[PDB]
Design a protein around this ligand. Structure first.
Ligand SMILES: CCCCCCCCCCCCCCCCCC(=O)OC[C@H](COP(=O)([O-])OCC(O)COP(=O)([O-])OC[C@@H](COC(=O)CCCCCCCCCCCCCCCCC)OC(=O)CCCCCCCCCCCCCCCCC)OC(=O)CCCCCCCCCCCCCCCCC
Ligand SMILES: CCCCCCCCCCCCCCCCCC(=O)OC[C@H](COP(=O)([O-])OCC(O)COP(=O)([O-])OC[C@@H](COC(=O)CCCCCCCCCCCCCCCCC)OC(=O)CCCCCCCCCCCCCCCCC)OC(=O)CCCCCCCCCCCCCCCCC
Ligand SMILES: CCCCCCCCCCCCCCCCCC(=O)OC[C@H](COP(=O)(O)OCCN)OC(=O)CCCCCCCCCCCCCCCCC
Ligand SMILES: CCCCCCCCCCCCCCCCCC(=O)OC[C@H](COP(=O)(O)OCCN)OC(=O)CCCCCCCCCCCCCCCCC
Ligand SMILES: CCCCCCCCCCCCCCCCCC(=O)OC[C@H](COP(=O)(O)OCCN)OC(=O)CCCCCCCCCCCCCCCCC
Ligand SMILES: CCCCCCCCCCCCCCCCCC(=O)OC[C@H](COP(=O)(O)OCCN)OC(=O)CCCCCCCCCCCCCCCCC
Ligand SMILES: CCCCCCCCCCCCO[C@@H]1O[C@H](CO)[C@@H](O[C@H]2O[C@H](CO)[C@@H](O)[C@H](O)[C@H]2O)[C@H](O)[C@H]1O
Ligand SMILES: CCCCCCCCCCCCO[C@@H]1O[C@H](CO)[C@@H](O[C@H]2O[C@H](CO)[C@@H](O)[C@H](O)[C@H]2O)[C@H](O)[C@H]1O
Ligand SMILES: CCCCCCCCCCCCO[C@@H]1O[C@H](CO)[C@@H](O[C@H]2O[C@H](CO)[C@@H](O)[C@H](O)[C@H]2O)[C@H](O)[C@H]1O
Ligand SMILES: CCCCCCCCCCCCO[C@@H]1O[C@H](CO)[C@@H](O[C@H]2O[C@H](CO)[C@@H](O)[C@H](O)[C@H]2O)[C@H](O)[C@H]1O
Ligand SMILES: CCCCCCCCCCCCO[C@@H]1O[C@H](CO)[C@@H](O[C@H]2O[C@H](CO)[C@@H](O)[C@H](O)[C@H]2O)[C@H](O)[C@H]1O
Ligand SMILES: CCCCCCCCCCCCO[C@@H]1O[C@H](CO)[C@@H](O[C@H]2O[C@H](CO)[C@@H](O)[C@H](O)[C@H]2O)[C@H](O)[C@H]1O
Ligand SMILES: N=C(N)NC(=N)NCCc1ccc(I)c(Cl)c1
Lengths: 459, 112, 63, 95, 140, 347, 98, 55
């Protein structure tokens, strides 16, 4: 992984030693080059994972998550450089440094062999993310959003640290390859119930699980666009990636410990989908849409079937591009009208025709139109939960109806109807904004031609 | 020994390489200290006082090398003590009789 | 990398990690015995040094 | 000592007064010299965890010399019995 | 505290209710006395009688919680015929929370106390069942 | 104070500590504490004002009481073992008295009330000594007598300190009181692990001292003693605001910063001993510290508080305070986690 | 233990309680601190003399000397407190409340 | 009802309230030498009578 870690680190001197007016050009060009080389991780084998060294490994789960992570950095830079234009030079370079450092922590997090190394980088991501929200958010509520984000995470993560250290004492290793062979079954006792909770709750909060999700709508409504993109696209998936790995050592106790969380997720996805129908803030609507989508991922991980694990992987990747695209779409309106209220600016299709097309394509992926990888992921989870229990189809089917209604309600409210008369500063879509939207949707749809690369190890 | 940083018996161990990655990191920390020294005193961060920046790296590396020597020696002593104790008390560390998975019974827990 | 390189590189990684895991379990067992019995180098708490004792004849005989 | 500078330099800053069986002016012995010597030699070098068990006999004797709790208790027992007999006329002390 | 805790944990659960309720009342009362002592020491009462009143109010409140937890948790185990059940302690802990919602008269405090004293009581029973150590003896 | 006298008084503070650390005789340990307390008082008094006089008096009463209790423990130990060697004590009542005395000297809860008040009433440089160098001698005695300390007593002191330190810091706007309550909380971690692995006590002490020295030095650099005064740093020395942010996050125990290492290692040692509830309770309670550290980052670095007009006059002058070792300490305070295995040098 | 030790330890306890239970005068509390020293001196001297620990015979002197130096520092703080407020009342030393 | 009220109330809002109240109890001290040293007496007494730390 040194061929990715080191060039990522080099982006920092690159940004700091650039000419004043070339910080965005240089950082964007070379982060795109790093993303190109990330495709070399597709050397996956049917039986063995790609095991580089004693520290780092990559398998079919972490590979698509790595490529998404390295793809997002250039997109984030493009998305940020307009609202940061008036910032002074040193504070721009600091902002870019936080983005680079987040990428560095993330690629190491998704490839760490040892669970305690994973924990430390898993936790290091809080610092740049918190700094980005509270320093470069626009509103007073960003300070409170930072605190909710910080302490929800640490409330669950500190128990995880104790559980992991306890496991290493008992088993002798936290190396994931070792744990695949030395894993022992988990017996019923109150000790193991709390071991199970300590091992899972930190990941549930990050997904987020319904009931522990209140931090998320705060964090998005307050974060700057780049903070929203990485928060939605990648940082939520730390929780999903965490469970997909740690559930290896929690069987067979997951048979019954999953029940409370499957119920919260199955009911939660309907509650949070219904909430989207009455949201007045466009960014808050997109944030609540993430909670509903990640509820499926939690259910998929908890029922532990080959089909559910494949659907969970595809869903995490697909939601990453869709949700980040939706935040970018909402931000482009915000840069003109400087408000997140959905009903403020309407009929925008009349004024911005091509942008309305990006809105349509993002909506259709959000509601999982076949054969998008959004639909592939959701369908695989639906297929596997039906085998878990036939009645889940009622809840899963109802959530599909609600998802269409709010996905198209958002499209109809902002794009259709009559334009607002007094909003006369809707300038034409910039080339930068159009390129930003295409760099989301084009790879998303191209993946429909070869879905296997985003289906994970169980493929 | 007694109140000795590196006892004479530590000289039987291979010294840390001068290209040790941990020693490189220690040198890097010294370089970062040199830059912060420039920054807090509002000097040109990268260019000011290269003589001062050189000594920051050298001082960190010099101390870091001896700290790394003591670190490796202590871990060598931990292993030495452990193995000698395992030998002294063979009754407490018997060789476990190993069975193959064909003989060992493991309950099966279906996921259905 | 061909599969053979990755496959045998994996075995080298597993050998090191399994060897470390065994030593971690052994160390915890050795520490438990040393602390309980006090017969090892670790948990060796000081006692008065017997070279401090004066053995020369004293002012009176009964000592 | 936390930092055993004294032993590193071979210089005696305060060890000379730590125990009563050490060298004293004009070879004046402490009252419990032999008991402290025995306990110190029993426990030397084996560590305090082992010594607390293996040298309990020497330490109990040394403690008895130090505070004489068992001796005073025995004397109290014999005296109390003597008062009873004096209070009952069954004992007349000799001259 | 050792001996009182030894009387309580010697009686089998779900039986000898009056002895369990006495043990918790003494435990609760002692906690109330300790709180009163520090309260009176650090926040000087305006008078001798105010300080005595505060000591009684706190001590009685703490003894009230201790009594209700012991009785309710022992009554539940007896009635349900489940001695080694953390649920009985969860029930008794919430009862104590209600009392603390009554002495302070605050439905909010009572609801919060019942959840947190209820959860804490259940964890204590689990710890006794499984040998959880709070102040673990050094071993390695 | 005459500069030569200041140096000699400072050297005597250090000598008193060193005597405690090299002594093998309880009497010499007691002398080291007495010498150290004699020399510290003048530096608390050096700015001549009623607050400094009150702080020195409260300090004198606390420390002199603790030293009498220590002497009592030594003498009981003498009667029940007939020797003075610095090591395990041979009487449980002597052990309790010495443990309580060292707790009073360290300002551990419930003997903590003097720390916030004394620290508030003395200059920053004097508070730096009080909260760093002055912890060395009492900790070095606990390091040696721990085989005989009562486990329930020491862990009760640790738990109370973490709770009182965390709660007490939530209500503070004075920087000197924040550091004081932070010190009380950190002493709790040091002593909680002492019964299990004293090496982790040393590791937490060393990292605590480095981080605490960094904060005090940065406060001295700008002559800031209140939260609002610190909130003007962004408009005078922006680099300082960033260094404070990193140090505060490190003091909050956030990975991948240095201050995570002591909490990480202490949790490991406790779990190896099947202590699970206490480490978890400790780690969650330490989030109270993280909260009032974060509050300071908000008003110092992550937002820009209002300024004054006279601040412009300060733009025309450079920092002239020594800030000795600040560049080195800030790097250690934040960037040491990759070198964690180096702790074995403390064995 | 011996009968004398009962009262010497009682004297130390009495002075410790006196020290921890303040009234108004700081001087009254400083006297209790010296009381604890005097009881420590007697207890140490008795133990050392009875056991014939010859080299330890100097220890009570060192205790006396160092504790008198401590008391001199304590008195100097008392007069500075008295110069500020006109009395040595502890209730005046409450500025650091806030 | 759920997201803006009860899910807030039952965790972050109640936890924050308890910490704030505890902080005021700890820090609302009179700054009096007499009161602090009196609490020392109670601590030492309780340490022996109630918890037997002296054994
Ligand atoms: C062997 C062990 C040791 C043996 C000792 C034997 C005795 C020999 C002498 C020892 C020295 C004793 C020193 C006494 C002293 O100077 O205190 C002055 C102290 C304060 O001096 P002050 O400034 O003149 O004010 C007097 C009052 O406080 C009135 O002023 P106020 O403004 O404070 O008025 C409000 C009042 C309010 O009082 C209350 O509300 C108390 C209510 C508690 C109800 C239960 O507050 C107090 O009285 C303070 C105490 C509060 C209680 C603290 C918790 C108990 O006065 C007292 O508190 C009187 C107590 C005397 C009893 C001594 C018994 C000692 C026993 C120790 C325990 C050993 C057991 C083992
Ligand atoms: C492995 C674990 C992690 C790594 C462990 C790292 C441990 C720390 C390593 C040691 C760090 C020492 C500081 C690095 C030296 C850089 C300072 C420097 O260039 O001063 C040049 C120094 C004066 O330069 P400057 O213009 O005053 O500004 C330098 C800094 O601002 C001076 O500002 P300052 O207030 O910070 O000065 C500090 C220094 C006083 O400044 C010095 O003179 C540096 C002395 C460094 C000695 C080298 C230590 C390594 C040898 C071990 C034996 O204090 C001392 O006395 C040394 C302790 O020129 C000399 O006289 C060289 C020393 C002659 C002997
Ligand atoms: C092998 C290569 C390693 C590459 C990775 C390095 C990053 C990891 C190490 C970071 C540790 C901190 C390094 C020390 C900070 C030095 C930078 C600094 O403090 O000065 C900022 C400076 C501002 O510009 P200037 O015009 O010179 O104004 C000076 C204001 N007194 O900035 C400048 O203009 C000077 C040019 C260099 C600036 C470097 C900025 C690094 C920022 C790191 C942020 C912390 C990590 C996140
Ligand atoms: C070593 C072994 C010792 C074990 C005992 C440890 C307890 C030490 C407590 C030290 C902190 C005391 C300061 C404090 O907690 O606050 C004082 C508080 C005063 O407030 P209060 O009267 O109780 O309530 C009115 C609120 N409107 O009143 C109190 O809360 C005092 C009770 C605190 C103890 C519980
Ligand atoms: C908040 C402040 C208070 C902190 C919480 C209070 C502590 C709660 C502890 C729950 C009980 C865990 C426990 O003590 O298990 C101990 C036991 C040790 O026994 P052992 O000998 O090692 O192995 C055989 C098992 N008897 O068995 C074990 O060690 C297994 C336990 C593994 C480690 C458990 C980690 C902590 C679990 C509690 C947190 C879980 C819930 C997290 C929820 C957060 C949600 C945001
Ligand atoms: C490892 C940690 C190293 C800590 C180094 C700290 C050095 C002091 C920080 C530099 C601040 C500038 C300075 O010179 O120190 C201030 C102080 C003198 O006070 P000041 O008011 O500035 O002037 C004196 C005139 N009366 O000078 C002092 O009194 C120094 C106070 C700090 C001494 C204690 C340092 C912590 C203990 C380190 C031992 C580690 C074991
Ligand atoms: C013995 C160990 C010493 C190790 C030292 C290794 C590095 C030494 C670097 C010395 C050169 C520093 O260069 C000095 O700082 C910057 C970066 O180049 C230059 O100016 C800078 O302006 C802007 C950024 O602000 C950029 O276009 C670019 O970074 C550079 O041109 C200064 O005009 C130059 O004087
Ligand atoms: C969002 C919140 C999620 C909350 C999830 C709650 C899950 C609850 C899981 C209950 C199962 C716990 O584990 C269960 O505990 C009981 C004790 O009561 C243990 O019981 C054990 O001790 C009892 C003694 O009373 C013995 O009779 C029994 O033989 C033994 O198994 C069982 O070994 C174990 O099966
Ligand atoms: C800040 C100031 C710091 C100043 C530090 C000065 C350190 C001075 C160390 C003095 C002790 C020197 O070393 C010690 O001295 C005394 C006398 O010389 C010697 O002692 C000698 O006199 C008496 C006579 O019975 C006994 O101690 C011993 O029999 C004899 O050797 C010690 O055997 C020696 O180990
Ligand atoms: C929000 C949560 C806050 C933190 C909650 C922490 C809960 C921690 C669990 C409580 C500690 C366990 O509780 C303790 O366990 C041990 C088990 O060896 C019990 O041990 C008991 O076993 C035997 C028989 O069973 C008894 O006769 C004896 O009295 C006692 O030794 C203790 O009686 C009990 O007090
Ligand atoms: C489920 C596991 C995780 C649970 C984590 C719970 C711990 C607390 C997390 C949030 C802490 C944030 O810290 C603090 O919280 C409270 C509300 O909670 C915020 O306060 C907010 O609610 C209060 C009361 O409604 C208002 O008075 C205040 O105006 C408002 O800002 C503070 O502005 C914030 O500084
Ligand atoms: C799962 C365990 C997690 C443990 C995490 C611990 C987190 C502790 C966070 C800090 C607690 C104190 O944080 C503090 O909370 C209170 C109320 O909640 C806030 O106080 C605010 O809301 C309250 C409630 O209406 C008002 O009375 C107050 O006037 C207002 O300022 C403070 O502005 C905030 O600073
Ligand atoms: N007291 C403890 N619980 N821990 C402890 N110090 N164990 C002694 C074991 C040990 C561990 C690391 C090294 I390096 C060395 Cl040489 C020895």
């Amino acid at each position: 992984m040194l061929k990715y870690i080191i060039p990522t680190i080099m982006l920092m001197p690159l940004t700091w030693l650039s000419k004043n007016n070339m910080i965005w050009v240089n950082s964007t060009a070379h982060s795109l080059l790093i993303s190109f080389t990330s495709l070399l991780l597709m050397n996956q084998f049917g039986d063995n994972s790609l095991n580089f060294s004693l520290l780092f490994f990559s398998d079919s789960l972490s590979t698509p998550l790595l490529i998404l992570t390295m793809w997002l950095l250039p997109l984030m830079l493009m998305a940020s450089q307009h609202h940061l234009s008036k910032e002074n030079l040193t504070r721009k370079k600091l902002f870019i440094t936080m983005l680079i450092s987040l990428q560095l922590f993330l690629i190491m997090t998704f490839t760490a062999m040892e669970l305690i190394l994973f924990y430390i980088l898993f936790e290091a991501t809080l610092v740049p993310t918190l700094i980005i929200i509270t320093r470069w958010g626009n509103q007073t509520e960003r300070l409170n959003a930072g605190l909710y984000f910080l302490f929800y995470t640490l409330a669950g993560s500190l128990p995880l640290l104790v559980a992991l250290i306890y496991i290493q004492n008992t088993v002798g290793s936290l190396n994931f390859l070792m744990l695949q062979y030395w894993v022992q079954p988990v017996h019923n006792s109150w000790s193991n119930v709390f071991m199970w909770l300590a091992c899972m709750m930190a990941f549930m909060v990050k997904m987020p699980l319904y009931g522990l999700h209140l931090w998320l709508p705060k964090a998005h409504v307050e974060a700057p666009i780049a903070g929203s993109m990485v928060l939605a696209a990648v940082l939520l998936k730390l929780g999903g990636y965490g469970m997909l790995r740690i559930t290896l050592i929690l069987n067979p106790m997951t048979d019954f410990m999953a029940y409370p969380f499957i119920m919260l997720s199955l009911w939660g996805m309907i509650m949070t989908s219904s909430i989207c129908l009455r949201q007045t803030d466009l960014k808050s609507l997109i944030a609540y849409s993430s909670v509903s989508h990640m509820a499926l991922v939690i259910v998929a991980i908890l029922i532990q079937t080959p089909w559910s694990y494949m659907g969970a992987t595809a869903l995490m990747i697909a939601h990453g591009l869709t949700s980040s695209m939706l935040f970018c779409l909402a931000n482009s309106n915000y840069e003109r009208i400087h408000s997140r209220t959905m009903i403020l600016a309407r009929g925008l299709q009349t004024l911005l025709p091509l942008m309305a097309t990006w809105w349509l394509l993002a909506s259709l992926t959000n509601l999982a139109l076949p054969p998008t990888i959004n639909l592939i992921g959701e369908l695989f989870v639906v297929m596997s939960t039906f085998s878990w229990s036939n009645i889940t189809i009622i809840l899963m089917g109802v959530n599909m109806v609600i998802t269409a209604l709010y996905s198209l309600y958002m499209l109809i409210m902002t794009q259709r109807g009559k334009y607002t008369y007094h909003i006369n500063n809707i300038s034409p879509s910039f080339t930068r904004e159009n390129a930003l939207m295409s760099l989301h949707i084009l790879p998303l749809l191209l993946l429909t031609l070869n879905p296997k690369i985003i289906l994970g190890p169980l493929y | 020994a007694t109140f000795q940083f590196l006892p004479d018996e530590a000289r039987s161990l291979p010294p840390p390489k001068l290209t040790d990655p941990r020693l490189a990191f220690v040198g890097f920390l010294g370089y970062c200290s040199g830059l912060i020294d420039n920054a807090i005193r509002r000097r040109p961060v990268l260019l000011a006082g290269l003589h001062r920046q050189l000594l920051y790296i050298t001082s960190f590396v010099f101390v870091g090398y001896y700290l790394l020597k003591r670190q490796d020696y202590m871990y060598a002593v931990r292993d030495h003590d452990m193995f000698s104790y395992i030998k002294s008390h063979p009754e407490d560390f018997p060789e476990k009789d190993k069975k193959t998975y064909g003989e060992v019974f493991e309950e099966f827990h279906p996921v259905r | 990398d061909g599969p053979e390189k990755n496959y045998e590189r994996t075995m080298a990684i597993l050998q090191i990690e399994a060897e470390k895991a065994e030593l971690r379990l052994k160390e915890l067992e050795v520490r438990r015995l040393m602390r309980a019995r006090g017969d090892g180098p670790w948990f060796h708490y000081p006692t008065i040094d017997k070279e401090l004792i004066d053995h020369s004849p004293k002012a009176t005989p009964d000592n | 000592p936390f930092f055993d500078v004294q032993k590193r330099l071979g210089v005696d800053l305060d060890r000379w007064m730590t125990i009563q069986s050490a060298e004293q002016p004009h070879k004046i012995p402490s009252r419990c010299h032999a008991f402290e010597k025995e306990w110190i030699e029993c426990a030397h070098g084996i560590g305090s965890i082992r010594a607390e068990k293996e040298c309990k006999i020497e330490f109990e004797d040394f403690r008895e010399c130090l505070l004489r709790q068992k001796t005073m208790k025995r004397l109290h027992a014999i005296r109390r019995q003597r008062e009873k007999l004096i209070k009952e006329g069954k004992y007349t002390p000799p001259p | 505290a050792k001996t009182v805790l030894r009387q309580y944990w010697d009686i089998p659960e779900g039986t000898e209710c009056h002895r369990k309720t006495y043990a918790t009342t003494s435990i609760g009362g002692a906690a109330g006395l300790v709180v009163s002592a520090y309260s009176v020491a650090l926040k000087t009462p305006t008078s001798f009688l105010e300080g005595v009143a505060r000591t009684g109010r706190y001590t009685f409140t703490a003894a009230a919680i201790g009594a209700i937890f012991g009785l309710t948790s022992c009554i539940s185990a007896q009635v349900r015929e489940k001695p080694d059940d953390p649920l009985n302690y969860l029930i008794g802990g919430c009862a104590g929370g209600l009392i603390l919602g009554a002495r302070t008269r605050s439905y909010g405090i009572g609801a919060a106390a019942c959840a947190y004293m209820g959860l804490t009581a259940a964890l204590v029973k689990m710890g006794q069942l499984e040998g959880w150590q709070v102040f673990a003896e050094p071993k390695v | 104070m005459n500069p030569i006298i200041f140096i000699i008084i400072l050297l005597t503070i250090m000598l008193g500590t060193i005597i405690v650390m090299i002594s093998s005789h309880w009497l010499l340990v007691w002398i080291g504490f007495e010498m150290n307390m004699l020399a510290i008082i003048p530096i608390m008094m050096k700015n001549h004002n009623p607050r400094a006089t009150e702080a020195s008096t409260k300090y004198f009463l606390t420390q002199s009481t603790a030293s009498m209790l220590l002497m009592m423990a030594v003498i009981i130990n003498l009667m029940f073992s007939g020797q003075w060697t610095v090591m395990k004590l041979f009487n449980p009542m002597a052990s309790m008295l010495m443990t309580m005395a060292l707790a009073m000297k360290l300002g551990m809860a419930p003997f903590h009330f003097w720390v916030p008040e004394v620290t508030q009433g003395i200059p920053l440089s004097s508070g730096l000594i009080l909260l760093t160098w002055q912890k060395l001698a009492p900790m070095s005695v606990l390091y040696q007598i721990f085989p005989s300390i009562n486990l329930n007593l020491i862990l009760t002191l640790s738990v109370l300190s973490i709770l009182i330190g965390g709660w007490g810091g939530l209500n503070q706007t004075q920087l000197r009181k924040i550091m004081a309550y932070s010190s009380i909380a950190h002493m709790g971690w040091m002593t909680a692990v002492l019964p299990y692995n004293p090496t982790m006590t040393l590791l937490n002490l060393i990292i605590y001292i480095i981080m605490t020295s960094t904060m005090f030095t940065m406060f001295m650099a700008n002559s800031t003693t209140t939260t609002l005064s610190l909130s003007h740093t962004w408009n005078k020395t922006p680099i300082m605001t960033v260094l404070i942010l990193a140090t505060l996050l490190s003091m909050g125990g956030l990975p991948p910063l240095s201050g995570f290492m002591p909490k990480w290692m202490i949790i490991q040692e406790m779990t190896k001993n099947n202590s699970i509830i206490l480490p978890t309770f400790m780690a969650i309670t330490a989030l109270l510290n993280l909260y009032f550290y974060m509050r300071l980052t908000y008003s110092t670095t992550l937002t820009m508080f209002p300024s004054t007009n006279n601040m412009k006059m300060k733009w025309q002058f450079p920092l002239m305070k020594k800030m000795t070792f600040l560049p080195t300490m800030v790097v250690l305070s934040t960037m040491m986690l990759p070198l964690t295995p180096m702790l074995s040098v403390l064995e | 233990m011996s009968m004398v030790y009962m009262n010497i330890m009682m004297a130390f306890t009495v002075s410790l309680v006196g020290l921890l239970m303040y009234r108004s005068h700081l001087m009254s509390s400083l006297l209790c601190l010296e009381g604890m020293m005097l009881s420590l001196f007697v207890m140490a001297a008795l133990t050392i003399l009875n056991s014939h620990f010859t080299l330890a015979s100097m220890m009570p002197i060192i205790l006396l000397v160092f504790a008198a130096c401590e008391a001199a520092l304590g008195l100097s703080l008392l007069v500075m407190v008295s110069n500020t407020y006109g009395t040595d009342y502890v209730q005046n030393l409450n500025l650091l409340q806030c | 009802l759920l997201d803006l009220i009860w899910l807030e109330a039952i965790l972050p809002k109640t936890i924050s309230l308890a910490q704030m109240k505890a902080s005021t109890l700890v820090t609302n001290q009179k700054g009096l030498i007499k009161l602090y040293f009196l609490s020392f007496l109670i601590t030492i007494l309780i340490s022996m009578i109630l918890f037997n730390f002296h054994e």
